[PDB]
């Protein structure tokens, strides 16, 4: 595409430079160009793709929430401007989510055979459908929610068969699926049950880990505990 004339390795190098420079839109464009070269992504390259788009869509979500709050307050006649601008931000956010989903569907997921890559991409698919669900209201809010759930469920099924309960991708998948249950699917009890079971099963497997792996796993376990403290 737009990055079609740049070498794959140069796109990856520039994505790392863009991360250092906090230029996340650039980072995401470089990583989109790298994916579109058609080769599978290494573990590090998958992380670059996820960091880039998470930062882009995170800024959009924060802006959408500010604007949605102002719009809800307004409903003196403020004119159409708050709604128009919230809609503009919403459409941009939806476009980024559709771009990420399109990369996953063409063709990252279908070529991902190892558990670490397939779970990673299916978790991303659940996440970006979840961000679509956050702004959805029309006749597809239900279908968007089901698409998020289905992606997270397939990732969970693979992760429980193929990864130890302390694996950081397995833990982060469970964390985010529990947030889906709490915030999107109106299932707080399922959120709490999943977070508790995930935490307890990880605790019981920590004895198998090196010092560095222990640090990685316990960091995500603390996020599960932080949510449980907020929810109970």
């Amino acid at each position: 595409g737009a990055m079609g004339s740049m070498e794959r390795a140069s796109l990856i190098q520039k994505a790392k430079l863009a991360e250092q420079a906090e230029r996340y839109e650039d980072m995401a464009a470089f990583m989109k160009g790298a994916v579109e070269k058609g080769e599978e992504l290494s573990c590090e390259e998958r992380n670059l793709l996820s960091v880039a788009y998470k930062n882009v869509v995170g800024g959009q979500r924060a802006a959408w929430r500010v604007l949605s709050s102002i719009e809800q307050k307004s409903n003196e006649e403020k004119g159409p401007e708050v709604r128009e601008y919230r809609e503009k931000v919403e459409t941009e956010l939806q476009g980024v989510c559709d771009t990420v989903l399109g990369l996953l569907d063409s063709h990252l997921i279908k070529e991902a055979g190892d558990a670490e890559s397939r779970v990673f991409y299916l978790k991303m698919k659940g996440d970006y459908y979840r961000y679509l669900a956050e702004v959805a209201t029309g006749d597809d809010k239900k279908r968007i929610i089901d698409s998020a759930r289905s992606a997270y469920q397939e990732a969970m099924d693979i992760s429980k068969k193929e990864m130890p309960p302390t694996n950081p991708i397995r833990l982060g998948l469970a964390l985010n699926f529990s947030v889906f249950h709490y915030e999107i699917a109106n299932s707080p009890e399922e959120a709490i049950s999943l977070a508790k079971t995930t935490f307890d099963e990880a605790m019981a497997d920590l004895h198998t880990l090196s010092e560095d792996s222990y640090k990685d796993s316990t960091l995500i376990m603390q996020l599960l505990r932080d949510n449980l403290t907020l929810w109970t």
């Binding site: 992380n47 996820s50 998470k54 982060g172 995500i220 996020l223 932080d226 907020l230």
Partner: peptide, 9 residues
């Protein structure tokens, strides 16, 4: 509450 922050490689 909080999902994976995920904003730093």
């Amino acid at each position: 509450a909080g999902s994976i922050p995920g904003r730093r490689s």
